[model samples]
Target chain A: TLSDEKRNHILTTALNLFDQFGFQHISIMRIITEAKIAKQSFYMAFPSKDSFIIECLDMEINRLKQSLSNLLGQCGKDDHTSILKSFYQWHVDLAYRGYNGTLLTKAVIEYWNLPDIKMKVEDFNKWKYEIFAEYLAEEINNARLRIIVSAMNGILLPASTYLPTWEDIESLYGEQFHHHHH
Target chain B: LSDEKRNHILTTALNLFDQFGFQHISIMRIITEAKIAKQSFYMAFPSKDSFIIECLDMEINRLKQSLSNLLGQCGKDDHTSILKSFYQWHVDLAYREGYNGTLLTKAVIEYWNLPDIKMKVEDFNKWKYEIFAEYLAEEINNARLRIIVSAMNGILLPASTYLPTWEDIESLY
Candidate 1:
């Protein structure tokens, strides 16, 4: 249906604009023009600008959730460190491609202090960490699990683009992670 | 000009910007929160954007100074301690100043794609990375240095907030 088509159209356009110009700077007029949709259609699909952003964030969260699942699924249950390495590579590749950093971080910072937006992201982060914790459940205690989860998220910051290569990531991961085991 | 007054205004504005996103914080709000005369604020910074840049520059300078100090105190060959000191500095920012992450990072994301601002951030990161490389010169090769700098920075993320204590940072540290 044109309805769903227009819905996806608006969300994708907003996502591109958000990534380029940031959440606060991008205007609805910009999204409407970029998406090449009529103003009425834009308003019809999303009640407000905030509503549209929430939708875009929801789409992003779902996209990442699936990617993480797929990445984790590729490894056998016993391949814990490999799974973690795969996750690290996933972020390194994104930065390499010029996304600069995780889009989720942009959402959290841009939409900071907004309860509805903040709560969703907070829950998503908690969910993300839980995935790692479960994977390491057999290998490490709760204390170390928390550190690994924090370190994994920490490495994904946008500033990471400064590094020259993924080999750098490989070398660093080797040091922090080598001694710990399943 | 009251140079002291000017520096005060800049510092206060930076503190406010840190607490609130740049887009949400206003010139009026910065002046009022900072308790400076309206004219004084204008005289100190020609515009909001310039003020933000100055704030960012100040942060970069502080980070370099602290890192340089840590570098100076530790022996050149003492690479592990130097790295630990770097990690410790990140934790201190979150714990002491209430900075969730590097202010340079916050500025980079807040003003994304704005070249004048973004370029300075890129240069600062390059500079910071170079210092790490120089510090690790005697110990590790370039590839390993790049990774350690990257990983050390990654650990500075705000996820530390969720941990039970700063001791957890030490544990993670």
Candidate 2:
């Protein structure tokens, strides 16, 4: 793994580019310039623009999964507390990083709304739901669990992205979910 | 008698613009295309662009009012029935018209999100919540009523806008 130097350079540069311009706008010329990698070398890793974009998404999910796993592991049988903590943590990190989750989510939404991207995004969504359903399996009884998780996913995403603070999000959640001890 | 034509022009043009694009679109164009006299337009209207744009929003609020009214009218005393009626109605209307509520809503969201427009939109929202809260106050007793309505608005707006058919919308609601 001493090849770490090359991978590190590409990963950081690519992630920064994707985070800033998003998947749709980034071009190989700009990314290579940002990454300071030879065009030949970039092609060695990612063959197409879509592949590169998806790879970037893959990498982010991988990075986030490790953090999510740690967050989920800390929660016992208590469902709401775990969810709240995870939701807040995601926001804190996003806010601290100076990324506008609202813009990003809306942008992704616009992307997903496009006919060409719909099927690919659908595949990603289905895969993402299956993963969520697994973690929520203990809390939810059946396939209906996926649907509920989907709704909660819909809720927390914007809340995490836009909430001024964790307390703001909790306040918003408190609107409907008064039964939760959290 | 002819004054009724302005309202027709306003309503028809507003609906057309809502369903279509806004770039280079104009009131003169609307009147000309609608075949109404420009001289008579001034007598019936104060300002063409402002009247048309504001009415664009009026038409939106009108639909929202109708939907909210359905929710408020329910005797069951829970927000669920009214909410379901609204969600299902949105679903059905979208289906029958072959319209994408999500697309229409996205346009409204972007248009209303404009800084100059936000206050009016917020006012409309407050009025809506006040109306809904009147019904909800009897059911829920707490500070969270406003929050619940706000969150419900958040959930339903996006869910209804982009998601497919009434059944699909109902599935979420």
Measured by TM-score, the strongest candidate is 1
Per-candidate Cα lDDT values, in order, are 0.68, 0.50
Judge candidate 1 at residue A11 and give its lDDT.
92
> Top lDDT: which candidate number?
1
What is candidate 1's lDDT per residue for A79-151, written digit by digit as tens? 8668767766765555555454566667766665655765676677778778877776655555555544554
Worst window of 10 by summed lDDT in candidate 2 chain B: B157-166
- TM-score of model 1 vs. true structure: 0.76
| lDDT comparing candidate 2 with the true structure | 0.50
Best by DockQ: 1
Give the distance in Å from residue A179's predicted Cα in candidate 1 to where it truly belongs.
8.7
Each model's DockQ score: 0.36, 0.09
lDDT of 2 by residue, B1-173 (tens): 26577567767666555454332246677778778887666666667545545565666577677767677567675566665564455444435432322333333333432443434544555565566566657765433343334334433322122233334333433
Residue ranges of candidate 1 with Cα displaced over 4 Å: A38-45, A75-85, A98-100, A133-155, A161-182, B31-44, B70-84, B95-101, B126-148, B158-173
TM-score of 2: 0.52
Model 2 residue runs over 4 Å out of place are A1-80, A88-114, A118-130, A141-182, B1-3, B21-52, B76-80, B86-109, B141-173
What lDDT is reached at residue A50 by model 2? Answer: 64
